[PDB]
């Protein structure tokens, strides 16, 4: 199933290792200004 990469600094610029970090986000039922009553706010 698996295979390595071949990395040396003898590689060209297209064959250079990237340390890709991916940030993924969401929004859920999961999560101070004084309350104003009867004011458009």
């Amino acid at each position, epitope marked *: 199933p*698996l295979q390595s990469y071949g990395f040396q600094p003898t590689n060209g610029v297209g064959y250079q290792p990237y340390r890709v970090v991916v940030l993924s986000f969401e929004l859920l039922h999961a999560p101070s200004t004084n309350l104003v009553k009867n004011k458009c706010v």
Partner: antibody
Amino acid sequence: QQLVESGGGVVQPGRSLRLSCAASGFTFSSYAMHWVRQAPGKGLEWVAVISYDGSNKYYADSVKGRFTISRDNSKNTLYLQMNSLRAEDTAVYYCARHATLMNNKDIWGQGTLVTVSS
Amino acid sequence: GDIQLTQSPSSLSASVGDRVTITCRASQSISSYLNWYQQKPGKAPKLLIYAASSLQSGVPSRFSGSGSGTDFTLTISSLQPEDFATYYCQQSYSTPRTFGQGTKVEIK
């Protein structure tokens, strides 16, 4: 990176001798592993596989002596017990790996002598 | 039955700068699943070619593999004084695996 073997020695025929071979550098776990035989002046003869990624054990029917093979994966080590001995098996053994068109992982142990004689 | 290998010649005493063709023939049609090894007698078998047509790290193109089916070829070129040792071919097509009987390239 490196393979170490259990100690070889002179054993009487018909007996049993467990063979230990521990890995280093990268694990046994993700790969398979093999055993081969070299008698002095004779070619390298394959013996048996191990396949940890499922579980299966294949033996050579040329030397079909129920030489049993299993693991100690958490020590990166492998155990094949020398069962039903006979003197022509007196040779050196190697821990082996085959580059099956995908990998380049062929790493070989140092070699220890099993001797079958009274 | 088993798959028979045919390594020819089983030895060849050679000289400096040669181009030796160590042939490993097969009893069946094996796709490319054949390898090559360096063994000075007492060493570990250092892999030379994988899948019968691909070089290896540390080993330059003085060794060169080709062939498929039944016919497999070890193309040693510009034969070096360190290359004189006992070599081997290798199937990985089926189970059981067998290896060739070896070819000792040695100084004439």
